[PDB]
């Protein structure tokens, strides 16, 4: 392979360079907002983000080593998780608000414009707040995101080997940050426990998305139907 041959610094480097860009919304600060319009915005944004996520996944070490069927499975399972962790990462330095796009900074007050989205908004806010208190580094974020892609549908030994490699990478980062052996284990645990919350938000968010739901795109409809 190659993912197993990479060093921890080479792993970080590969992940940082594979990072997708931060896309812009089609938000006009005139305009309403409303349930239909806001859901229209977020759907259009996520739809475009999906294309970059797909090509980002190929650049994740060990991912293209998998079969096409397994690649499809992992992305169908993790796509909303990956969108969510990206969202809360963008919103770290924006307390009480979610940065969907540089031109789209929403608070929980406006999340109520869509009926039943305010709860998930609060969970997204709490998660972003959690990242802020932990002072989550970019090198750690790209590791967590890659873990989500590989783990959320892993239920095979190659993937687990790459997972152990990313684990070593996280530890390597924390060790260079001056953290003691005890502090490294704890921080490693805290980060991975947050993935459980991210999984939870995805599941809760997903069952809302494929409910009565305004026009979703063709790709996004297939990503949703994979959970239905």
């Amino acid at each position: 392979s190659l993912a197993l041959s990479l060093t921890a610094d080479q792993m970080v480097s590969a992940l940082l360079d594979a990072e997708p860009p931060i896309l812009y919304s089609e938000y006009d600060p005139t305009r309403p907002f409303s349930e239909a319009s806001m859901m229209g915005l977020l759907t259009n944004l996520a739809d475009r983000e999906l294309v970059h996520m797909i090509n980002w996944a190929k650049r994740v070490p060990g991912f293209v080593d998998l079969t096409l069927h397994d690649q499809v499975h992992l992305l169908e399972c993790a796509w909303l998780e990956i969108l969510m962790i990206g969202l809360v990462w963008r919103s770290m330095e924006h307390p009480g608000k979610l940065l969907f796009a540089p031109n789209l900074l929403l608070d929980r007050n406006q999340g109520k414009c869509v009926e039943g989205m305010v709860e998930i908004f609060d969970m997204l806010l709490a998660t972003s707040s959690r990242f802020r208190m932990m002072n989550l580094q970019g090198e750690e974020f790209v590791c967590l995101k890659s873990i989500i892609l590989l783990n959320s549908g892993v239920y095979k030994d190659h993937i687990h080997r790459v997972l152990d490699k990313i684990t070593d990478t996280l530890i390597h980062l924390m060790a260079k940050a001056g953290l003691t052996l005890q502090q490294q284990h704890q921080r490693l645990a805290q980060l991975l426990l947050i993935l459980s919350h991210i999984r939870h938000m995805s599941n809760k968010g997903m069952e809302h998305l494929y409910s009565m739901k305004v026009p979703l795109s063709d790709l996004l409809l297939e990503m949703l139907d994979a959970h239905r």
């Binding site: 797909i54 690649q71 990503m223």
Partner: peptide, 9 residues
């Protein structure tokens, strides 16, 4: 599936 072909390319 769109996801399948985009990963293919």
């Amino acid at each position: 599936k769109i996801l399948h072909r985009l990963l293919q390319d």
